[PDB]
Amino acid sequence: ESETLNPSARIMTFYPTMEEFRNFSRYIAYIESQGAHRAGLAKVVPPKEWKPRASYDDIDDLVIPAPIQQLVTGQSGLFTQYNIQKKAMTVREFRKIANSDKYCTPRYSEFEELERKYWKNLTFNPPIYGADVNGTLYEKHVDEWNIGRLRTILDLVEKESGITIEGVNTPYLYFGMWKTSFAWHTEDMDLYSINYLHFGEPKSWYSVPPEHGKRLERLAKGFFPGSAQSCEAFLRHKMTLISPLMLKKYGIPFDKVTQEAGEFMITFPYGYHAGFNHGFNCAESTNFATRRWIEYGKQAVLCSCRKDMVKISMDVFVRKFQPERYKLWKAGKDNTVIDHTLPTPEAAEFE
């Protein structure tokens, strides 16, 4: 059944009606019944009727406490990105820098032109990414796809333990400018993520199907043996950029998609993604889960070289949703193998 859904594992795009759109978990379950998860990435375009905020003309005073200057080093489609923390600044200050002649978007015809220019000039004139800003731009009453309160089973973390993990069970805002990037990664604990582009120039994405994720890891370990020996999951450092031409060259399947203002991106468990911003923009994002994620969570290989890293206790999820397996899991004998093609069980509604 599942094997025959989206057998190309291409990035799918969905256009829900407002009735479909009102229930978040249900629609995620729906797109999985359509095999969307196999791509590792899906676009969801909300009804034109819908808006999370009436106006963004009131945010110029919003502070970006830790802007990041992105210094990229490398050649031949392989790069390492170093973060240089800069002093706090306001959205208006950032926009000014972003739109200045030094940092603004280059002129171009088709997207393929801008893409070529990104991968040619990535290491020159390091931009500033106003990333990881704690907050939401959703109005308090918006009940559909509210990144602040999505109500998935990831809520069980805070519920059981009181722990908040910034950007994971709370929202992050990202203010981008041209040539700012996010390196190849999956989410913390191999969770889902949701990304909403509030406004501005587009954000382009690359994705590797979860069922081919290990091949990407193998390639990465080969190009960075030093990093691979120092850490069991060095891609979680989110410093590694790899061009689509390199991926092609080594037979890693991947897809590309460009996200525009007003559009959602969903990433799926163990879906590697990377990309860049076209120009000044603003994205909001957080992580979430489904019953399917639990096994990914149990098997996630985490960064072994930093103490700062995100780790969620799987115990409560296994007790509540896999009680028959808890003793086996705790005794280290749970050898369940993940089928990346299966949809989450909540999808059984749509079969």
Ligand SMILES: COCC(=O)Nc1ccc(O)c(-c2cc(C(=O)O)ccn2)c1
């Ligand atoms: C050192 O690098 C920090 C980083 O990339 N953090 C991070 C951690 C998890 C993520 O899901 C994203 C992220 C960022 C973007 C984006 O910048 O828009 C798109 C998709 N994912 C970014």
Ligand SMILES: [Mn+2]
């Ligand atoms: Mn991500």
Ligand SMILES: [Zn+2]
């Ligand atoms: Zn590490």
